[PDB]
Design a binder for this molecule. Structure first.
Ligand code: D9P
Ligand code: D9P
Ligand code: D9P
Ligand code: D9P
Ligand code: NAG
Ligand code: NAG
Ligand code: NAG
Ligand code: NAG
Lengths: 121, 121, 121, 121
């Protein structure tokens, strides 16, 4: 019932487009963040992920990686597709944003965490 | 070159194998977890990710999704490949483990967080 | 301007009451969660925290621990008090919920993560 | 068996001293981080927390807030006191570091996450 393919926007105004989900739960897309910590121009960035198919849930868990094109960083998102009380779909996700550090001693400070809620455009 | 390709084990005893990293930073592999939250007999599970290639860092950031084959869950990992003080490679990662819940009202409890350190086998 | 003292509710329906913040940034209160992971019954539970006072910010960062009275668990929250575009106050927080485990080998699964948004009652 | 009172060091070299745990599980102490991202001199900073006393566990969960004296930030830690195979105590903790941001629109980027392991000094 709750399918990742298509166009989504989040609570921060960011957009993503996810393509077809193949029989193995794999998908690809693009991500346009509306926000950045960096002082660079934001670029559309590719994403790759999977959606869990065990017991063929109508509201499956999923995960994807966003490989940013304007920074040395990587973000991963994980969450679940729900059908809220109206029949409306909603992705409830959490993410980790990993920055690059030069030295292994700075590893401790390299990872940020937050949430995003996506709905269809 | 701190390279993701090859065989890795973590501090919990889990194993992963990552294949070739193509010119777009994409890779695939398999994951055998040594631990679970789940009711089930553990199965080798596929993973898909990307390694960031901006400025071609010798210690790049990366992310990957593990699409578990014995549970309704998904885990995402993100981190960075370092060359420690010996010349040994080490992946420092953090993860988010998303469980499935039946009801959107239980979403709050569905996400666990932790770390793992990988070294070569 | 944005003061922790008083009564707050969150997006999950939980309530908290925070007493006076002394000259060291310390405060105490109580927390009544509207949600829990088990069927044991919920009890009002104490909280203890501090609010950062460096540069006496009108929107300071803060942290508090909730010492649950119906579980072996502990939750910590950290966040910042903002004055949104209207003059309304809002606490943006993240939390870590640590469960007890009885073997150190299960430590990996003991920590959950999420967010909460509080506004005044 | 596993008591928070005393002097502890972590895997990054940071030290903390925790005072008596009163009958309500409350404790106070001081934290000297060995690392910082800020361009300031590190200062000893106060901590306030609680240890969970439900069922009087010999290895309880706990939480504490560190009110930093050289930045506008706050850190919270949560974890559990274990007695390792040898009768060694160990604190396994996770933390959230909340930075101050000027604008609520930057909230998303204000929270970092990690772990620490403490042992007695
Ligand atoms: C995951 C969050 N949710 C969104 O929709 N967008 C957010 C990600 C921010 C964009 C990443 C690049 C960046 O700002 C930076 C130092 C990095 C680093 C820096
Ligand atoms: C992320 C951690 N690191 C590992 O090596 N394995 C851990 C995750 C394995 C969980 C298996 C699926 C599951 O429990 C579901 C609920
Ligand atoms: C921070 C969130 N926002 C809010 O407003 N409230 C939320 C916190 C939930 C309240 C914690 C008590 C709890 O869920 C538990 C209550 C009771 C439990 C009993 C056994 C348990 C075993 C293993 C893990 C457990 C985790 C949690 C248990 C529990 C566990
Ligand atoms: C919890 C960890 N384990 C320990 O033993 N000590 C660690 C805590 C570090 C001390 C916090 C002060 C700090 O470095 C910061 C304090 C304040 C900050 C404000 C803005 C920031 C933006 C980007 C990166 C930042 C990094 C660090 C910032 C900071 C940052
Ligand atoms: C998101 O999509 C909407 C509608 O397609 C568009 O108007 C908006 O500008 C997009 N936002 C970003 C950040 O690209
Ligand atoms: C990981 O590989 C090691 C060494 O090859 C092996 O002994 C171990 O059983 C593997 N772990 C799992 C969980 O299969
Ligand atoms: C919090 O306060 C509101 C309004 O006073 C009340 O209706 C609600 O049930 C309270 N929630 C809990 C969990 O006590
Ligand atoms: C921690 O304590 C040890 C032993 O007393 C000391 O040698 C070390 O410098 C301390 N570290 C910090 C950051 O204060």
């Amino acid at each position: 019932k709750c399918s990742l393919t298509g166009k989504w926007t989040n609570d921060l105004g960011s957009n993503m487009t996810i393509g077809a989900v193949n029989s193995r739960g794999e998908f690809t897309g693009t991500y346009t963040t509306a926000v950045t910590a960096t002082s660079n121009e934001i670029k559309e960035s590719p994403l790759h992920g999977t959606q869990n198919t065990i017991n063929k849930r109508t509201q499956p868990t999923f995960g994807f990686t966003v490989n940013w094109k304007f920074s040395e960083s990587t973000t991963v998102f994980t969450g679940q597709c729900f059908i809220d009380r109206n029949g409306k779909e909603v992705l409830k996700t959490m993410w980790l944003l990993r920055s690059s550090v030069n030295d292994i001693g700075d590893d401790w400070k390299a990872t940020r965490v937050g949430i995003n809620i996506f709905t269809r455009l």
